[PDB]
């Protein structure tokens, strides 16, 4: 292409979505998801008994940068894993659940517009 890269259009969209999820506009609700859950710092001694496959936005970013995700479905599965872990682990009235839902709405509305 005259500008771009060689990655699929779909993966360009995934890139763009993750960039948005990192943007300042969303930071008040996105920040819990930026980095791996810090089980030591938060004293979450049950986390790894409950959550088999931790996921976070930085890990997702790394996997996009390495071209690990071969398509948008694989990317979207990791985003949804991140949110599902939050829903599984945390009390249902926890503020972090409310934050998850908001960031998940950002993600799902835009992911629904994936090129095809």
Curated annotation (Swiss-Prot):
Post-translational modification: Phosphorylation by CK2 disrupt the intramolecular binding between the bromo domain 2 and the NPS region and promotes binding between the NPS and the BID regions, leading to activate the protein and promote binding to acetylated histones. In absence of phosphorylation, BRD4 does not localize to p53/TP53 target gene promoters, phosphorylation promoting recruitment to p53/TP53 target promoters.
Record site: Acetylated histone binding: 90
The organism's place on the tree of life at top rank: Eukaryota
Null allele phenotype: Embryonic lethal. Embryos ndie shortly after implantation and are compromised in their ability to maintain an inner cell mass.
Compartmental location: Nucleus; Chromosome
Residue ranges of domain Bromo in the record: 5-114
Family named by the database record: Belongs to the BET family.
Note: JQ1, a thieno-triazolo-1,4-diazepine derivative, and I-BET, a benzodiazepine derivative, have been tested on tumors with success. Treatment with GSK1210151A (I-BET151, a I-BET derivative) has strong effets on mixed lineage leukemia and promotes myeloid differentiation and leukemia stem-cell depletion.
Subunit comment: Binds acetylated histone H4. Interacts with p53/TP53; the interaction is direct. Interacts (via CTD region) with CDK9 and CCNT1, acting as an associated component of P-TEFb complex. Interacts with RELA (when acetylated at 'Lys-310'). Interacts (via NET domain) with NSD3, CHD4, BICRA and ATAD5. The interaction with BICRA bridges BRD4 to the GBAF complex. Interacts (via NET domain) with JMJD6 (via JmjC and N-terminal domains); the interaction is stronger in presence of ssRNA and recruits JMJD6 on distal enhancers. Interacts with NSD3. Interacts with NIPBL.
Function: Chromatin reader protein that recognizes and binds acetylated histones and plays a key role in transmission of epigenetic memory across cell divisions and transcription regulation. Remains associated with acetylated chromatin throughout the entire cell cycle and provides epigenetic memory for postmitotic G1 gene transcription by preserving acetylated chromatin status and maintaining high-order chromatin structure. During interphase, plays a key role in regulating the transcription of signal-inducible genes by associating with the P-TEFb complex and recruiting it to promoters.
Domain text: The NET domain mediates interaction with a number of chromatin proteins involved in transcription regulation (NSD3, JMJD6, CHD4, GLTSCR1 and ATAD5).
Name of the protein in its database record: Bromodomain-containing protein 4
Lineage: Eukaryota, Metazoa, Chordata, Craniata, Vertebrata
Residues represented out of the complete protein: 349 to 460 of 1400
């Amino acid at each position: 292409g005259a500008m771009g890269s060689k990655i699929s259009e779909q993966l360009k969209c995934c890139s763009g979505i993750l960039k948005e999820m990192f943007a300042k506009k969303h930071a008040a609700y996105a920040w819990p998801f930026y980095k791996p859950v810090d089980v030591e710092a938060l004293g979450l001694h049950d986390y790894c008994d409950i959550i088999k496959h931790p996921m976070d936005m930085s890990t997702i970013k790394s996997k996009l940068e390495s071209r690990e995700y071969r398509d948008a479905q694989e990317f979207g599965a990791d985003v949804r894993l991140m949110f599902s872990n939050c829903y599984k682990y945390n009390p249902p009235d926890h503020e972090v659940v409310a934050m998850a839902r908001k960031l998940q709405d950002v993600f799902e509305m835009r992911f629904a517009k994936m090129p095809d």
